[PDB]
Design an enzyme around this catalytic site. Structure first.
Site, PDB file in Angstrom:
ATOM      1  N   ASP A  12       0.897  -1.162  -0.020  1.00 58.23           N
ATOM      2  CA  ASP A  12      -0.044   0.136  -0.205  1.00 58.23           C
ATOM      3  C   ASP A  12       0.876   1.330  -0.036  1.00 58.23           C
ATOM      4  OD1 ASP A  12      -1.557   2.212   0.451  1.00 58.23           O
ATOM      5  OD2 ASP A  12      -2.249   1.559   2.539  1.00 58.23           O
ATOM      6  N   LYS A  73       2.948  11.543  -3.527  1.00 58.01           N
ATOM      7  CA  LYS A  73       1.789  10.776  -4.243  1.00 58.01           C
ATOM      8  C   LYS A  73       0.822  11.990  -4.970  1.00 58.01           C
ATOM      9  CE  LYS A  73      -1.747   7.462  -3.032  1.00 58.01           C
ATOM     10  NZ  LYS A  73      -2.358   6.250  -2.184  1.00 58.01           N
ATOM     11  N   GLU A 177      -7.277   0.863  -4.416  1.00 56.77           N
ATOM     12  CA  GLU A 177      -7.184   0.711  -3.077  1.00 56.77           C
ATOM     13  C   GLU A 177      -8.326  -0.028  -2.460  1.00 56.77           C
ATOM     14  OE1 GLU A 177      -5.651   4.570  -1.925  1.00 56.77           O
ATOM     15  OE2 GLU A 177      -3.905   4.371  -2.690  1.00 56.77           O
ATOM     16  N   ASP A 201     -13.008   5.278   3.608  1.00 57.95           N
ATOM     17  CA  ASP A 201     -11.467   5.581   3.750  1.00 57.95           C
ATOM     18  C   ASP A 201     -11.075   6.890   4.498  1.00 57.95           C
ATOM     19  OD1 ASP A 201      -8.541   5.716   3.864  1.00 57.95           O
ATOM     20  OD2 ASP A 201      -8.424   5.091   1.761  1.00 57.95           O
TER      21      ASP A 201
END
Ligand code: SGV
Length: 390
Positions: A12, A73, A177, A201
């Site tokens: 991850d 990211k 994800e 999330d």
């Protein structure tokens, strides 16, 4: 033939933290790093003599903010001109430069000014994740499954692959994800029939809602929604502001212009915040916070919930939007899955549970680890090479 095959890993690659797993003996093992942490900061620090990755990088960020890179990211696979890139740049202490409308992070490293593409920074985080797994397994690791947000485009997916290739990893697949989290719970193994799954999330600085439909093991992304800048760090911020005001009231002193004092307060607030997820109250004790003054206080769960109340409530707006996009009613969602460490907050859990009329939430798999868990399950599946029996 048939020399024993090395296990493949699931990674991850998070905005703030990364996590690595391996599927062995019918189970997933989430691998702790050498400092004993089951998640590693997605941080890289540069000095005159060293390149530091993970905990060692995050732990020296206070005095080296210009050469400690994080949030790579948010830049990966994007153009420099991208509006998101231009807005995000204002919040980072490190320099982001324009090289042919491609962003690069520029730092001081081993006596020179060096610039790196986001995928080079992410390759350094992936090299650390690979090493963590190799330290546990006791042999070199080659194959990996790496996850990305469901909203990533081809460019962002390709740049993530390039990051793995630079790190010396063979990227088996790039998977979403939310999908990985669903796999962790085995939501793709319930047989024939359509199943609607909502992934909630809430992480350190980002909030994503994803709606998937699973039919005979096949996944479809039905909707994606969220708040780009909503997460755990905003809750830490409300506690900081509350205690800055409390210090002023009690001592008639403003601590806000001393970076060390504010930093020490924030670190203490984040720790108290975690305690409040399992306890009704938490103590906050800092020695010589400002002008030699000790700060010994406490906060109730009720006061913390009141301080962050509007923020917690706002997590339901993307839930209504995603359902509107997926063309579904709440009743239609078969499974609810919690991802991200901030989903441990009782109030957040309650709000979602009440919105879905008392439905159980899948939270048995550690929220911080579910995405890597699912990536590890898929990696083990991918390297199988069975030849059919007669
Ligand atoms: N691992 C835990 O127990 C927790 C991690 N976070 C937050 O989750 C985010 C990612 O670690 C950060 O904002 C953390 O503060 C938490 N927030 C509240 N309660 C908790 N128990 C945790």
């Amino acid at each position: 033939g048939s020399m024993a095959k090395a296990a493949a890993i699931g990674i991850d690659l998070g905005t703030t933290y990364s996590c690595v797993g391996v599927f062995q003996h019918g189970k997933v093992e989430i691998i702790a790093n050498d400092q004993g942490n089951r998640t590693t900061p997605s941080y890289v620090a540069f000095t005159d003599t060293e390149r530091l990755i993970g905990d060692a990088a995050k732990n020296q960020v206070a005095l080296n903010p210009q050469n400690t890179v994080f949030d790579a990211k948010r830049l990966i696979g994007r153009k420099f001109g991208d509006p998101v890139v231009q807005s995000d740049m204002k919040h980072w202490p490190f320099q982001v430069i324009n090289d042919g409308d491609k962003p690069k992070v520029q730092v001081s490293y081993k006596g020179e000014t060096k610039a790196f593409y986001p995928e080079e920074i992410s390759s350094m985080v992936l090299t650390k994740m690979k090493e963590i797994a190799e330290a546990y397994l006791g042999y070199p690791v080659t194959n990996a499954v790496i996850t990305v947000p469901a909203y990533f485009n081809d460019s962002q997916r390709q740049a993530t692959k390039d990051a793995g290739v630079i790190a010396g990893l063979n990227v088996l697949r790039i998977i979403n994800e939310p999908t990985a989290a669903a796999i962790a719970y085995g939501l793709d193994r319930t047989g024939k029939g359509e199943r609607n799954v909502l992934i909630f999330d809430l992480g350190g600085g980002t909030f994503d809602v994803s709606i998937l439909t699973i039919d005979d093991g096949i996944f479809e992304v039905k909707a994606t929604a969220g708040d780009t800048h909503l997460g755990g760090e905003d809750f830490d911020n409300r506690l900081v502001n509350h205690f800055v005001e409390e210090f002023k009231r009690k001592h008639k002193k403003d601590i806000s212009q001393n970076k060390r004092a504010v930093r020490r307060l924030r670190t203490a607030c984040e720790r108290a915040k975690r305690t409040l997820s399992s306890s009704t109250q938490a103590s906050l004790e800092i020695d010589s916070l400002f002008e030699g003054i000790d700060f010994y206080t406490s906060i109730t769960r009720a006061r913390f919930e009141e301080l962050c109340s509007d923020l917690f409530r706002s997590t339901l707006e993307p839930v209504e939007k995603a359902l509107r996009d997926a063309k579904l009613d709440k009743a239609q969602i078969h499974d609810l899955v919690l991802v991200g460490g901030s989903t441990r907050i009782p109030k957040v859990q309650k709000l979602l549970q009440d919105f879905f009329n008392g439905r159980d939430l899948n939270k048995s798999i550690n929220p911080d680890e579910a995405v890597a868990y699912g990536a590890a399950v898929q990696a083990a599946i991918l390297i199988k090479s069975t030849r059919a029996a007669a």
